[PDB]
C-alpha cells in the first residue's frame, strides 16, 4: 500500500464530517517515507508523542470548524530509513 | 455523506490487502438508498442478518484468494424507504481447514 492509496482514505475521512470515529489496523505494517510522514501530518498540530518499548504513538489534531477538531493517532516504528505504521485512529472531538 | 464517497473508501479497503481491520462510526447516520446498498454488496455473499428492536446488523463476505475473505458488517435502520447507517466494520479473515 503506497502513500497515495493512503491519501485516498484520508480524503474521505477529512472531507466527511459524519465520520465520528475510524480505526484502521494494518498487517503487514504499511511502509511510508520520511517525507510522506511529514506530508501525512501536514498542517496538523502535534499533540503527544510516546516512545514505547516497541513502537512510537503520536497524536495530532486539525481544526475542522467551531470547537471541533479531527484528532489523529498512530502507532509506528522506524527501521532502515522508513516508517512502519501499525495502526491509525481518527476521531472528531469537541474541545472544551 | 454521498454514496460515491463511501464507494471511494471501499475501493481502498478492497485494493489494499494490508488493511486487516477497519471500524467506522457515523454521527450523524449516513443515509443511502436501497439501490446504493445493493450496489455496495454487489458481489458479496450474505452471511447473517439480525433484526433487533432498534437496528439491523447485516454481515457479508467477499472471497479474495486462497482461504482469505473480506468480512463486512454494518448496523443500520430503515426510515421512509432509506437506509441510515450507524457503523460499518471490515475485516480480513482466514478460514482455516480444521479438525484432523
Label each residue of A49-93 as H, E or C.
EEECCCCEEEEEEEEEECCEEEEEEEEEEEECCEEEEEEEEEEEE
Helix (H, G, I), strand (E, B) or coil at B36: helix
Q: CA–CA distance from A67 to each of A49, A59, A61, B29 (Å)?
A: 23, 18, 12, 21
The pair phi, psi for residue B66, each rounded to 5°, is 50, -130
The pair phi, psi for residue B34, each rounded to 5°, is -60, -40
Helix (H, G, I), strand (E, B) or coil at B9: helix
Distance CA B81, CA B51 (A): 16
User: What is the number of domains present in chain B?
Assistant: 1
CA angle A49, A55, A58 (to 5 degrees): 25
Provide the domain limits for residue B32. 1-100
Which residues in chain A have Cβ-Cβ distances shorter than 8 Å to B30? 18
Q: Where are the beta strands (DSSP E) in B1-100?
A: 19-33, 45-51, 56-65, 68-79, 82-94
Q: How many CB atoms lie within 10 A of CB A83?
A: 21
Q: How close B93 comes to chain A (CA, Å)?
A: 12
Distance CA B89, CA B24 (A): 6
From the list A5, A12, A23, which residue is nearest B16 (CB)?
A: A5
Cα four-point dihedral sign A6, B25, A89, A11: positive
Resolution for this experimental structure (Å): 1.9
Q: Are B50 and B57 in contact (CB under 8 A)?
A: yes
Contact flag A18-B26 (C-beta cutoff 8 Å)? yes
Distance CA B98, CA A52 (A): 37
To the nearest 10 degrees (0 to 180), the angle between helices A3-15 and B3-15 is: 150
| B99: alpha, beta or left? (left if phi > 0; alpha if psi -120 to 50) | left
Burial (CB count <10 Å: 0-12, 13-18, 19+), residue B18 = middle
The pair phi, psi for residue A63, each rounded to 5°, is -65, 135
Which of A72, A57, A63, A48 shows the shortest CA–CA distance to A95?
A63
Residue length of chain B: 100
Residue of A2, A7, A22, A75 best to disrupt the B interface, most CBs of B under 10 A:
A22
Distance CA B23, CA B19 (A): 11
- What cell does B8 get? 471511494
Amino acid at each position: 500500500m503506497n502513500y497515495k492509496e493512503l491519501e485516498k482514505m484520508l480524503d474521505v475521512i477529512f472531507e466527511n464530517s459524519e465520520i465520528k470515529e475510524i480505526d484502521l489496523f494494518f498487517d503487514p505494517e504499511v511502509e511510508i517515507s520520511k517525507q510522506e510522514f511529514e506530508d501525512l501530518v501536514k498542517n496538523a498540530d502535534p499533540l503527544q508523542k510516546v516512545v514505547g518499548d516497541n513502537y512510537i504513538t503520536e497524536t495530532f489534531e486539525w481544526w475542522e470548524f467551531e470547537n471541533q477538531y479531527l484528532e489523529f493517532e498512530l502507532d509506528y516504528y522506524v527501521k532502515d530509513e522508513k516508517i512502519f505504521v501499525l495502526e491509525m485512529h481518527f476521531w472528531r472531538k469537541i474541545r472544551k
